[PDB]
Amino acid sequence: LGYTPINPDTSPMLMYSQCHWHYNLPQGMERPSSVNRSLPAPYQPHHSSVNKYRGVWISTEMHPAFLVGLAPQLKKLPHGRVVPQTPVAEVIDEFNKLSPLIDDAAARDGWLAKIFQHCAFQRSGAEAMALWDKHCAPRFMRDDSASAPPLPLVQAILFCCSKSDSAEWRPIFTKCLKDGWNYTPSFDTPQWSYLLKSLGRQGDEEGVRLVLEEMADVQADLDRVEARSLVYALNAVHDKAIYNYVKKYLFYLGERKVKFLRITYADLRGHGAEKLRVPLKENDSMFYHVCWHASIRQPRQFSPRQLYFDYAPSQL
């Protein structure tokens, strides 16, 4: 009987009142609580996956015999989860000279694939991009040739052209939609993560138009795309038309991701901008709309003294 409340889990006068059991009654189980097994919830943690690979995978496709033979000439490239630091010139030299020896169109691709992973991790996509010009784009992309690239090739090169900003993603990527080889869905969520930020780094608001349109079109994890990425693909947008498209776009992102977007965007811009290797173009209109859009999808906590401070009691 005071300010200190009664602990309802330890008080007899409560627990042994009439509004609960008495200690005399048969004291059996009242009602079985089947909660977790009738309507179960899925596991969406806040602490990111500790052991997730956190990167694109290049997925060698060479014949087993080649792997044994190609072992040293491949080992300067990033192995499974481990990447040495050889200079890219030391690699591309090694490929071009050894390319004719490999009688396989497929093996050389996987060979060339790891080089993309190598150059991309070394940010030296510019030189390996020329290898796409000499080797890949002619036999595969040129004029709808019958030879369709094995998946790792575009899987790799799309990282290559993305990690180091190079506008050569648009030609290949457009050949990956429904019209081309249709390799769009098999992408992992990290693929679109580096992809969007590269655009945001570049500023291709019209590329944001294309790739984002495919995201919902493909039914990818549009929530699990890392926030540092989406901040870029939004911030590059300044024109009117795409600005309309993005407002329609956010209603695809789950409220939880949306609540953290206005948290990361307000961070990469103002408070902890030091994280960003690239200084963001500062678009205020896109900035405000997001902070407003997030405070809409979220529940609206009722603060009375704010809304009705000057409200006039109309006595007439």
Binding site: N244, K247, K248, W292, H293, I296
Partner: peptide, 14 residues
């Protein structure tokens, strides 16, 4: 707060 985005170009889908 409505409208948020301009809906679409006026059309005749039929």
């Amino acid at each position: 707060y409505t409208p948020i985005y301009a809906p679409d170009p006026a059309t005749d889908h039929l």
